[PDB]
Design a protein around this ligand. Structure first.
Ligand SMILES: Nc1nc2c(ncn2[C@@H]2O[C@H](COP(=O)(O)OP(=O)(O)OP(=O)(O)O)[C@@H](OP(=O)(O)OP(=O)(O)O)[C@H]2O)c(=O)[nH]1
Ligand SMILES: Nc1nc2c(ncn2[C@@H]2O[C@H](COP(=O)(O)OP(=O)(O)OP(=O)(O)O)[C@@H](OP(=O)(O)OP(=O)(O)O)[C@H]2O)c(=O)[nH]1
Ligand SMILES: Nc1nc2c(ncn2[C@@H]2O[C@H](COP(=O)(O)OP(=O)(O)OP(=O)(O)O)[C@@H](OP(=O)(O)OP(=O)(O)O)[C@H]2O)c(=O)[nH]1
Ligand SMILES: O=P(O)(O)OC[C@H]1O[C@H](O)[C@H](O)[C@@H]1O
Ligand SMILES: Nc1nc2[nH]cnc2c(=O)[nH]1
Ligand SMILES: Nc1nc2[nH]cnc2c(=O)[nH]1
Ligand SMILES: Nc1nc2[nH]cnc2c(=O)[nH]1
Lengths: 454, 448, 444, 454
């Protein structure tokens, strides 16, 4: 079974040298990744328990890039049947298919292994930001003149029915207020709010739904985007994905997501508490069903007792009140618009927010690096927030990730230079997630895997 | 003036360019004795989407609701006093409810305010004029409207199946028209919504076609984006059949049986021997018996020739939709061949028997000629009335009062048809199709 | 001989069988000649001939039938003018006007002649609205921007150019144009406004041509009009003009312009309309100064310096004309917001019944007019205009000339000074060569 | 106020911060005079001044600044012509052309010169030129995806009489009545009349997608304001790329009388249409004018037939004084163009498969040694002789009428052309016939032919 797909929504106006480039990249060591992402996209919304095994059902699927005088076509070999309706590919899959071609072959292929974009220095913090903007602009995701209304939703890939219901309700309440949704693109909390918002949009006869799925190559290669997504963007790596979330967001909503939730909040506080960002407007709301109350309590307790009472100027917790979450998002859009007008910033992309270069770069949780963290109350709060994220991420990896356990077994616990008040707060928070089964440790009791010294 | 929740709504989707004489009429009608009907239909619309069971959720909880027509130089506004709170988002009415509110004003107040309705030519002209008034007949649109009939009370198995058919229909960019109620009248619209989104189809038309005795006690489902209320069931049925390019029938009760008999009554009329109107009866695998029974009852009373006009498809949602889509070019060509319009099937002949409004009085119920010696169309017309009266006696204020004053309808006829019809209804009652869950149904008919 | 079939465009595209039956019978009636002549005139739009009568005279073998096809209507054209077709396809502009004739001549005009009382003032106004609504000419929500332009159908190159400049300046400000739809001043503002729209990337050009069955049956609409509306008589056309306008610009138009100005002043000086916002500007090139001065001198002296509350004269300043119009649009929007009125159709303007009715200058009608400075000012104007139709007809129109020669002078009953101003005006127009013949047909 | 700020319209509205910095930098370079003069020519569009060089001198105190904002760019105009403004606001059409000037003068120059450090040594320069031309058109948003062919290119004199002007306008009206769009060199004269008529015809057909493309180059527009009908201004980097762009976006070409340059124009097209690689291409070419041009075209027709062969008439058609027929032929050709692009899989909006010889993308300096290395012999491949005859014409003419040419002829003598005698005779008969039609005017009164066989 072989079918030729023409472009839709992207990759529809290429030069002959660009197509030449695309064909070369498709024949590179990148093919496997390109093929797995394109397979992921074609399996979107195919109901399945385990998605890793679903893709392992189409091992005879392949994809070639076809050259034509006018540009590019896609050749699908043994594609999933469910992606076709009386022989024609379903339009939504077709557009996501060409977003994968765009972001994996055209962008990622000129970045991975060697940077071929002329004069791009990926070690340069301004270049990075301009790249993230170029990717989003290339994806046609930044509209000229559009008044702000994009709400980014973060939260667990794997969540229970209560949480999925509540998140769906928030999205429905955002939908009834004509707000748009951007998420990480996968299942769980990344899907429920879009599903809700789609119902809301229909009720308000709102015809410009933007459901933005912002992912990255390692993830989309194994996880089909959820079926609500109608604007797929694959950023080159997780640091750039996070910067993209921040810069397109007009508001951020965090649902529960395990330990990662606290890492996300610390990243945001590290940005939002930088004195350079004291005049930015970016509403941040943490919200769950009534059963997540103690989950957000320990989190909020850890933030205040390490970063201070001022931390609460920047985030607000709301338990089981979907309508009030959306109501507050909706009310803040006009303030975000004024804030953008105030600095002459763009409505669709927040240029003026300062994201420190360390927040753009990866962090290796080695014993050396773990050691260099200055976890002391006398540090600038935005630096301490940042270092706290690094340390929390390292302690948890040392418990749950095999590359982290490997480091601990080989070299013993991490040596942490920190105030023991701060480090106690951390053990409370870690203990909290273990007790609440939000953190599931291999084996039994919670392992410190760290020690407070030099 | 007591403390009350108040809002003014401007016209949306209709009633936005009125003359001052027209507005004057609206205000007069709105204060006439039609007010209760107008007020109950407006309340039902404002309860679209809530999950409680109707009647007990309607007038009961909103006794303090009222609605006034407001006059302005430019036109009309609606004033809502104590409307249901969930109809509003931060104080502003949800747009789909708003459009439905003004369809109610258009069809209850404006369409009556201007209303020989005994002449078949005038009935059809009236049905056309209402449809056109509602902006429901698109000039140029190629055929793609599918009418779906089915039970208001169905199980999850049946609901999910009809959703699947709906999705398969929306994946083929077909539009849906239903009776606008819950159950099988909602599930295919839910599915088609998902399919239209998957295809980036931007012209979803979800037509909800009801009538005032029904809408007054059954809110429209939340998918309906084009509410139309015809003046009676007869005109509801004629509208359904004039705008359909294909019809799909899911398992239902008497309302769906009334629609089937009505339809066979038109399709077996020799005057329509050359009409193209694909008709598919479908359900999940668990409904194989339902359709066995229903097909036997049709063949017994109307003859094996009835099967020229429908096809039963059990548990195959993709194949139902594929056949519907495959027929749209045949419908277009048939319209071209007979000089007809694409949006409104003028060629179909609907006999007076099936057009003349039927009052479900005990007198008229006892007088139906349900005997095997009538011509096929005639018998179909009379079975249509028999089911129509059972609907009224179950769900309508006129018929419910008629039952609680004179007892159950007595239906007589050929004992062989009567047995078939008695067992069919015991199936509907057994299968929980007569009424929604909560309290055992009490038959308003007595078959002898 | 040469036969083509035309599908509907912009109207009459969604008809009931009863309606199509009706159209076919009406086309078969003694109406058919008017229906045929208006259709022929539409099809001759934008032709390059000097006489409209000699042009429409060479199409003797042209005819038109109403067909039923696909349950709607098609127009059968027999021997139509070839200039109306491109490679066999009718030009869309002409096509839409053609079905506008069908709409307003056969479907409206044919059918008015149920509970409709054409003598009832409120019915008249609701009819005009209905005809406009039916022509899809009243947009919901649309911010005011429609400027009505009045002026002579026959004007010199200098007046045409000026009116084109006013049109350009109006279009550069994104204002739309409604004229009586013929040539001359009814055409130049539209020509100019289209150029200005283009420079502003303005895409929603509305050029409404509002006419009446006797006019268009002999005068092809100009090629700029893109919304043709045929009102049933001159009185309903005048009301239509007033009710859709957001401002009005009057160009030179001979002595008719005096009737025009009196009509509007009869409406604007009516105390009932004291809070109405309707900018009125009179304007022409430098050569029109004397003409507008004598006009202004007649108005102030018969109706008082108060009449100047309701108009402004601007000589040879196109930008300033359009500038004022543009600046008024928000005041009109606010005025409608405040009375709860429609933006597209001014319901609250009071038009006195007598102004919705015709007037035959019979000596008896002439003599019932009360031309006294004692009359209410709104009434004196309505009668002053009526006395103008008569005196001028009884100087230039044969039926009125023969009436003065075969029945006496019109023998009016008016103040001496009122009448004297009238001769001043007519003598002024006669002396300026604006009105070409002066015999005062009155008596006092 | 004497100073006003303009926001982007129609282009230049979604810029990165690195792009804006590069714009500000280019604007401060020795490009500024060129950028300023083009911006001023644009604001003067539609001025009723005879000499458009005198008109651009009365603005000695005009200047323009590129303004940086967080979100993008604005233009700062200093003493702009007041006619470009309505009640203080720039007329939208001038505003869009103003940012087309910024796009093609500053940004396209800047995108040039941001190349790779390791360029592909196997890439023909001709392939780059063609792909660059495409890139410029794509960047101007000038190539629509999926649009059916309907672009007619019109060439002809910038200075023409009443009678020629009205004819070109009727041709335009007839084109528009058939819903064809117009592209010209955007000056006045025959470059304006066809758009004027086309607009009228568009209004009569309720065609609301008018595309009036003016394709120019920075030397022309710096001196000559664009005509007021143009609604898509494109400025190609030089005259050769402007010629290639004309050929590549055209679906048909109409040539009006234009003095003796018209002969150059026709030889350019013949050099392409008669190339053997283009034998299957579909590109209707029509020469047309009023009755009074029949001799002008009969002269051109005889030179082509007698130097390139009667077969040259397989590629153009002459039509005198039938405007409806011209338009009728083009309209009928449009579906043949569509089918031709569909057959090859070429783009509807850009003709990639047409072969344009590399010599035709390169400029020609009419030096004596260059004039001598032209091989004007009939045993030359026809497409090459067409090209060399074209180089020969520009040189001989420039020698007879252009200052720098007449001066070089006086210093180093007459041009020493090696070529067949009959050919040079046919060339002479053309130049004579033009001067004798007064279609060609040479300093003095005696046409003294400035060449000499060898
Ligand atoms: N900051 C910002 N402005 C944007 C954006 N998109 C459009 N705009 C508009 O660009 C205009 C900027 O205002 P200007 O008057 O030209 O100049 P400034 O106010 O000094 O701002 P600036 O120096 O450029 O940063 C406003 O329109 P108006 O002038 O018509 O006033 P309105 O807002 O009512 O629509 C903005 O609405 C955007 O993405 N970011
Ligand atoms: N007078 C008038 N109003 C019109 C017209 N078309 C729409 N409208 C709108 O009708 C709406 C009335 O809504 P309300 O504000 O709730 O009522 P009121 O303002 O008190 O006036 P009303 O009682 O109806 O006479 C206004 O919209 P918004 O409230 O959202 O205000 P906007 O869009 O301007 O921002 C008007 O703008 C029209 O042709 N004439
Ligand atoms: N050559 C060309 N085609 C274009 C262009 N823009 C859109 N198309 C369409 O892209 C599709 C490609 O052709 P295919 O259907 O895939 O069949 P092929 O003959 O094999 O073309 P190919 O070999 O790939 O070049 C066609 O649409 P459909 O498949 O839907 O058929 P339709 O438009 O008729 O409804 C073309 O009409 C263009 O600029 N140039
Ligand atoms: O009587 P039932 O068949 O159970 O359901 C009633 C509805 O069934 C049909 O679709 C009609 O639309 C009815 O409103
Ligand atoms: N990169 C990233 N993906 C997510 N998915 C859900 N939540 C998040 C988040 O906070 N960051
Ligand atoms: N009814 C009417 N028609 C006109 N046509 C041109 N001018 C006018 C005018 O002033 N009134
Ligand atoms: N580049 C270019 N511009 C023109 N303007 C008019 N004619 C021409 C032509 O033949 N080539």
């Amino acid at each position: 079974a072989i079918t030729h797909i023409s472009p839709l929504g992207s990759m529809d106006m290429l030069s002959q040298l660009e197509v030449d480039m695309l064909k070369r990249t498709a024949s590179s060591d990148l093919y496997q990744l390109f093929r797995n992402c394109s397979l992921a996209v074609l399996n979107s919304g195919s109901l399945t328990d385990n998605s890793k095994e679903l893709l392992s059902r189409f091992e005879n699927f392949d994809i070639n890039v076809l050259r034509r005088e006018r540009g590019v076509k896609l050749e699908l070999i043994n594609p999933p049947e469910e992606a076709f309706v009386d022989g024609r590919i379903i339009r939504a899959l077709q557009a996501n298919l060409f977003a994968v071609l765009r972001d994996i072959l055209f962008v990622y292929g000129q970045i991975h292994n060697t940077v071929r974009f002329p004069n791009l220095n990926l070690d340069n913090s301004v270049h990075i930001t301009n790249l993230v903007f170029s990717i989003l602009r290339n994806a046609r995701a930044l509209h000229v003149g559009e008044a702000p209304n994009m709400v980014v939703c973060w939260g667990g890939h794997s969540i229970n029915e209560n949480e999925y219901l509540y998140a769906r309700r928030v999205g429905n309440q955002l939908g009834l207020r004509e707000l748009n949704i951007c998420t990480g693109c996968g299942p769980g909390a990344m899907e429920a709010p879009m599903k809700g918002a789609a119902v809301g949009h229909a009720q308000q006869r709102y015809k410009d739904s933007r459901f933005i799925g912002m992912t990255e190559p390692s993830i989309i290669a194994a996880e089909p985007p959820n079926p609500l997504v109608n604007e797929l963007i694959i950023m080159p790596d997780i640091e750039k994905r996070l910067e993209a979330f921040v810069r397109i967001a007009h508001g951020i909503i965090i649902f529960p997501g395990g330990v990662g939730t606290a890492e996300e909040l610390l990243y945001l506080l590290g940005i939002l508490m930088n004195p350079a960002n004291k005049d930015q407007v970016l509403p941040l709301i943490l919200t769950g069903p009534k059963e997540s109350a103690d989950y957000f309590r320990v989190l909020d307790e850890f933030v205040v007792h390490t970063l201070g009472e001022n931390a609460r100027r920047h985030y607000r917790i709301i338990i089981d009140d979907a309508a009030e979450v959306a109501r507050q998002m909706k009310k803040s859009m006009p303030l975000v618009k004024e804030n953008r007008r105030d600095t002459g910033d763009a409505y669709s992309f927040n240029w003026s927010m300062r994201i420190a270069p360390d927040l753009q770069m990866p962090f290796e949780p080695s014993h050396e690096n773990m050691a260099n963290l200055k976890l002391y109350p006398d540090q600038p709060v935005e630096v301490l927030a940042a270092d706290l994220r690094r340390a929390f991420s390292g302690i948890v990896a040392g418990n749950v990730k095999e590359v982290g356990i490997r480091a601990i077994e080989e070299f013993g616990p991490y040596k942490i230079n920190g105030d023991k008040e701060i480090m106690r707060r951390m053990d409370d928070l870690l203990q909290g997630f273990v007790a609440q089964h939000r953190m599931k440790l291999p084996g039994s009791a919670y392992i410190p895997c760290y020690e407070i010294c030099t």
